[PDB]
């Protein structure tokens, strides 16, 4: 009864393989999912190719040029597990902690392989 | 009867213009607080007092 409702909205919806909203002279060529990172990669390759055939022409507006630059003022340090002002950082696993209770209850008994998980949120998951 | 006018805030900019005639003609210093910012024009003696206090960029 619940399944037949989904089918009911389905036959309210379906379009056959020759679609009505079609150009009447088109079909589907080859189409694979190409990675967005790969799209940025070969866009970079195309601008690099164009610039290297141009100089031997500053780009006016690309995806790379409109990316925001890094900040010039020093970034504020925060505690990695509690989010407060991280005054201290552990010398073993490089985790910024708030105070003594945090350190002795979390940072010292922390299992290996999760400090990289904490540093991934800050974008310093050094381990690769 | 005297008036006391004061300037408070952070040194964002410190550009000493020389205009020799080795000796700086004037220094343009911009201050900044929570309510806004304001730029000042200062003589050589205030610049020498600034170098006395070891004021750099970012000091209140």
């Amino acid at each position: 009864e619940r399944l037949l409702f989904l089918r009911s909205v389905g036959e309210r919806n379906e379009i056959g393989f020759p679609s009505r909203f079609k150009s009447a002279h088109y079909k589907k060529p080859t189409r694979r999912h190409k990675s967005a990172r790969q799209l940025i990669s070969d866009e970079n390759k195309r601008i690099n190719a164009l610039l290297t055939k141009a100089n031997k022409l500053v780009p006016k507006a690309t995806y790379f040029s409109v990316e925001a630059p890094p900040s010039i003022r020093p970034a504020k340090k925060y505690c990695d597990v509690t989010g407060l002002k991280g005054f201290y950082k552990s010398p073993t696993n490089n985790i910024r902690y708030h105070n003594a209770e945090i350190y002795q209850l979390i940072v010292k008994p922390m299992a290996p392989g999760v400090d990289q998980e904490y540093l991934k949120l800050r974008g310093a998951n050094f381990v690769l | 009867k005297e008036t006391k006018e004061v300037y408070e805030g952070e040194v964002t900019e410190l550009t000493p213009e020389d205009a020799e005639n080795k000796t700086i003609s004037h220094v343009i210093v911009g201050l900044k607080s929570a309510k806004g910012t304001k730029t000042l024009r200062l003589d050589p003696t205030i610049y020498e007092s600034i170098q006395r206090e070891k004021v750099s960029i970012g000091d209140v």
């Binding site: 005054f87 201290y88 105070n99 003594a100 | -």
Partner: protein, 82 residues
């Protein structure tokens, strides 16, 4: 060096060496946790010291050398109002 116990003042940039810790190789025990701690120090200063300080011709060294030289009345009345 390694093994020393020191006190670092962040605001004034003053370091004081409290002493070497318990390393066999002066000896003072290792301090307790919770660094960057709030410490309240209560200061008691006599009015004569403020009178000597506020008189600009006398440094604080007149409190020890004992050469104050007839501190005037206007610095004293300024101190009393302050």
């Amino acid at each position: 060096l390694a093994g020393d116990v020191i006190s670092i003042d962040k605001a004034s940039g003053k370091i004081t060496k409290l002493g070497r810790s318990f390393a066999r190789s002066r000896f003072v025990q290792c301090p307790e946790g919770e660094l960057q701690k709030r410490k309240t120090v209560v200061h008691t200063v006599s009015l004569h010291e403020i009178d000597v300080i506020n008189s600009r011709t006398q440094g604080f060294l007149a409190l020890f050398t004992g050469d104050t030289g007839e501190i005037r009345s206007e610095v004293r009345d300024q101190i009393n109002t302050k």
